[PDB]
């Protein structure tokens, strides 16, 4: 990272970043199977197994009601629209049965819908296996007062994933803001990331930033089919990496003239990214975040431009407003402020209270000289990388 404080205007330019873009999505559907538990019923008085069995039986009904309400006639709306479209495609019975038949003998099937998508499907059957094998044999003539506290603990430890999934899906009207550890486990996420069509470099980058991968995704509930739960979860795709890119952070350049303020604020602030073919521009601050030396922007909210970055449209997007404004431009390796406006501005330190009280005039700084900047008892934090 090389931050260049531009020497002839109050709007700096930077360079040296390597960019990664969100170029698509990878669908992934699951067939979490509860197992047949509606038959089992205990009437011996309150006990330990009874509470868990009732909890599971109520969670199933709650998920059924949530799915019934679901069918209505951090990320942009493109993600949710694509997810809704894929869910509508999956919902139909013919391909629901096709997926169920595909996931009958093995636990890995790269199937395909009526349209063209990668809907690699994985099934989990721990709860169903437990209920079918051990619980039915252990229960005998409807006797829930069995001294196997180990078995009760095993039931509590086994039904946890299904209970958590039901609660998470019910608490957010069928769509979850992000992918919890219960929705996809570590090994399953690693396999799903490694199986999608991207190069080895991007695969390694995602195997590193699993956290970002899991924060950018989401999941949608499909519906309840008999005695099973079917949901879908998407993983963001980073297709193009290692491109040079830059950010413009501009502030008004106001010069006091004994009452009259002559500011200069360009309107081209944002991240510019010259990939193969053109240069893209993301206006919103939420599109891009800084991950050390890299930057993560999503291509779904990009604008196209052709020739720029001369600081001089063609005479450059620049305004000449006469009304000044005070705030802090927290660049990754600095800060630029134009607080004149009869206000107080100063400099803070990580070990000394008050050093180098800030004068006005679109000031200058070399990162480490300060760690917090104050403007009339306001706290601003410098990202110390």
């Amino acid at each position, epitope marked *: 990272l090389k931050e260049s404080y531009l020497e002839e205007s109050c709007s700096t330019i930077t360079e040296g970043y390597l960019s990664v873009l969100r170029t698509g999505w990878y669908t992934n559907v699951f067939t979490l199977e509860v197992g047949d538990v509606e038959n089992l019923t205990c009437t011996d008085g309150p006990s330990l197994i009874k*509470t*868990e069995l009732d*909890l599971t039986k109520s969670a199933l009904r709650e998920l059924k009601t949530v799915s019934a309400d679901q069918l209505a006639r951090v990320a942009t709306a493109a993600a949710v629209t694509a997810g809704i479209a894929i869910a509508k495609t999956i919902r139909l019975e013919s391909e629901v049965n096709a997926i169920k038949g595909a996931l009958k003998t093995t636990n890995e099937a790269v199937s395909t819908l009526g349209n063209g998508v990668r809907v690699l499907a994985t099934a989990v059957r721990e709860l169903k296996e437990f209920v079918s094998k051990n619980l039915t044999s252990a229960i005998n003539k409807n006797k829930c007062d069995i001294a196997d506290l180990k078995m009760a603990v095993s039931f*509590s*430890q086994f039904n*946890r994933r299904f*209970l*958590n999934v039901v*609660r*998470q899906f019910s*608490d*957010n009207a069928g769509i979850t*803001p*992000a*992918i*919890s*550890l*219960d929705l996809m486990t*570590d090994a399953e996420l690693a396999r799903a990331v490694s199986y999608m069509p991207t190069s080895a470099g991007q695969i390694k980058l995602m195997l590193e*930033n*699993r*956290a970002m991968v*899991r*924060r950018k995704g989401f999941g949608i509930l499909i519906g309840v089919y008999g005695s099973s739960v079917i949901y879908m979860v998407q993983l963001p795709i980073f297709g193009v990496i290692d491109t040079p890119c830059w950010i413009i952070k501009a502030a008004p350049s106001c010069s006091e003239k004994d009452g009259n303020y002559a500011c200069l604020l360009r309107e081209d602030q944002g991240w510019y990214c010259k990939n193969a073919g053109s240069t893209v521009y993301y206006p919103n601050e939420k599109d891009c*975040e*800084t*991950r*050390g030396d890299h930057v993560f922007c999503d291509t779904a909210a990009g604008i196209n431009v052709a020739e720029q970055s001369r600081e001089c449209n063609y005479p450059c997007k620049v305004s000449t407003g006469r009304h000044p404004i005070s705030m802090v431009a927290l660049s990754p390796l600095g800060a630029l402020v134009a607080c004149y406006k009869g206000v107080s501005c100063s400099i*803070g*330190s*990580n*070990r*000394v*209270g008050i050093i180098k009280q800030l004068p006005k005039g679109c000031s200058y700084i070399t990162n480490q000289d300060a*760690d*917090t900047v104050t403007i009339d008892n306001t*706290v601003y*934090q410098l*990202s*110390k*990388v």
Partner: antibody
Amino acid sequence: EVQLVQSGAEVKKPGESLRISCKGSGYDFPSYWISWVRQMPGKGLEWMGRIDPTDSNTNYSPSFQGHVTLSADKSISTAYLQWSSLKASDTAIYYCARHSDSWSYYEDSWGQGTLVTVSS
Amino acid sequence: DIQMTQSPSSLSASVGDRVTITCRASQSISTYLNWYQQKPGKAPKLLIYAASSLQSGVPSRFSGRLSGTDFTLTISSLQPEDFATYYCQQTYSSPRTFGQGTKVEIK
């Protein structure tokens, strides 16, 4: 199994600097984010600092800013915390705590806890 | 800062009795919320994350509920092994804060 242990600095005179370390073991350092926390006796926990996974945000609480220099060290999987100016009110127990994956940011696998006192 | 107010400060209940603890947030934090349990002289252990889930290695009587900007922990059945202090913490973004704490005593 992630195991977190503490370091030893019991008594530190007023007007001096204190430093302790939390030697993480078992897991790897640069995969998920790490943080500190403290508790003076007879009160509730309050948050002090954190290091987001690779953002290196190294953010601190707004009140106790300009006083702490939380820093990581990838060399031997160790994190240190250094204090600028100790007062007669910062006596507490200092916990080192990890963070986790997923979206809810739940702190798990805490540390054993070390008591630090200020006195003449 | 996202202040938190916890209520009631301290309470006592018999064994096999439902206990409720309510945490209130100054501003909306959606569903990012965690609970904690700290026995005296020990490190806290995680109980509930995302205000509704259940972290591994925890008995199934610890259930939480969300209602807008109000959260609640409800112990299904108090047990003699449940004397501690319960906190609530938000994780909306940088930074994070805790609560004042609620003390639970048994009879």
